[PDB]
Design a protein around this ligand. Structure first.
Ligand SMILES: Nc1nccc(-c2c(-c3ccc(F)cc3)ncn2C2CCNCC2)n1
Length: 350
């Protein structure tokens, strides 16, 4: 495509190697197009981003590239290549290339009903991927159907680590009604109560939500706003026990819970009468109110529902658990640009 190829009025400079573009979507420094990788003879997915004007966007870009490049797993999308100018001065945009995944669980569910065998396989892959992520001491933090890529062969890959953090269980407590950025419907109850979401159990809850969703094609706790989300959860799980309340020390959070009328638990087999009993048993253990009593990823994999797939020797863990040296977003966009430039250097044809 002549000098710089063009896509819907925007320059999509993916050089020679990648051709036959095609628009897919675009929300900010994020326009995605599928192209043809002349080198591997396969159409890929490419995302154009320009986060250098804003320090924040530089943080999510740096952080996610590092994670995604460090991670190597069959159930986590990998970066196949990264395009950028040869000089930091000339680098305005950055193109990241990933395998082309036709669809995702969000689109699948808004059209198809899944058999129990597909839900099982999908769940297996989700957890197989999460076990690796967690083994690297990283928390995804934004797991939801739209963040689970799927190809024509049922192959599932977790993507979107823009909100991922290095686990930090000790510094997880915060006040009641503390703002959160992760997608509302899949947020664990403790996030609206006292958690910063720096604990692994936060991802398991999201997976539990995805499970319920696969079972009924509808989001289980579709809260309209912050506190609505919580009443949605309590509506089905019912009022928290004394025990689980005695854990919540943040006085305000506990008093809020106590002020609420008593609500009984709604049986799962009632919510999902077509569901498989083993599935609903694992769902129960995932959607546990108390984070400390919530099942772990490895325990989930070893659950009877996933019996036909479970194979610990075939469920790899990270070789090098993560450590974010520039942890805590205190870096100017300048320094961040140098790090991104440096992090993407390995793909340079120079
Ligand atoms: N692998 C793949 N395949 C198809 C689409 C996407 C993709 C990208 C993206 C990100 C980084 C990158 F380097 C290349 C593409 N951003 C959003 N989505 C989709 C993710 C699921 N819902 C609709 C948009 N990713």
């Amino acid at each position: 495509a002549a000098g710089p190829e063009m896509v819907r009025g925007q320059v999509f400079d993916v050089g020679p190697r990648y051709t036959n573009l095609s628009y897919i979507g675009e929300g900010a420094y994020g326009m995605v197009c599928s192209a043809y990788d002349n080198l591997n003879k396969v159409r890929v997915a490419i995302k154009k981003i320009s986060p250098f004007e804003h320090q924040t966007y530089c943080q999510r870009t740096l952080r996610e590239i590092k994670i995604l490049l460090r991670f190597r797993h069959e159930n986590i999308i990998g970066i196949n290549d990264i395009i950028r100018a040869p000089t930091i001065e000339q680098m305005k945009d950055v193109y990241i290339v990933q395998d082309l995944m036709e669809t995702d669980l969000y689109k699948l569910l808004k059209t198809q009903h899944l058999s129990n065998d597909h839900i099982c396989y999908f769940l297996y892959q989700i957890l197989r991927g999460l076990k690796y992520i967690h083994s690297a001491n990283v928390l995804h933090r934004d797991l939801k159907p739209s963040n689970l890529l799927l190809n024509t062969t049922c192959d599932l890959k977790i993507c979107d680590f823009g909100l991922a953090r290095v686990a930090d269980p000790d510094h997880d407590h915060t006040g009641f009604l503390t703002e959160y950025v992760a997608t509302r419907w899949y947020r664990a109850p403790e996030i609206m109560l006292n958690s910063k979401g720096y604990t692994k159990s936060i991802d398991i809850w999201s997976v539990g939500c995805i499970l319920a969703e696969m079972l009924s094609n509808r989001p289980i706790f579709p809260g309209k706003h912050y506190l609505d989300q919580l009443n949605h959860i309590l509506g089905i799980l019912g009022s928290p026990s004394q025990e689980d309340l005695n854990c919540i020390i943040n006085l305000k959070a506990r008093n809020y819970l106590l002020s609420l009328p008593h609500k009984n638990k709604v049986p799962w087999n009632r919510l999902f009468p077509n569901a498989d009993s083993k599935a609903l048993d694992l769902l129960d253990k995932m959607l546990t109110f108390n984070p400390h009593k919530r099942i772990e990823v490895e325990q989930a994999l070893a659950h009877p529902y996933l019996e036909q797939y479970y194979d610990p020797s075939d469920e790899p863990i990270a070789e090098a658990p993560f450590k974010f040296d520039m942890e805590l977003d205190d870096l100017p966009k300048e320094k961040l640009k140098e790090l991104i430039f440096e992090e993407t250097a390995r793909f340079q044809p120079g």
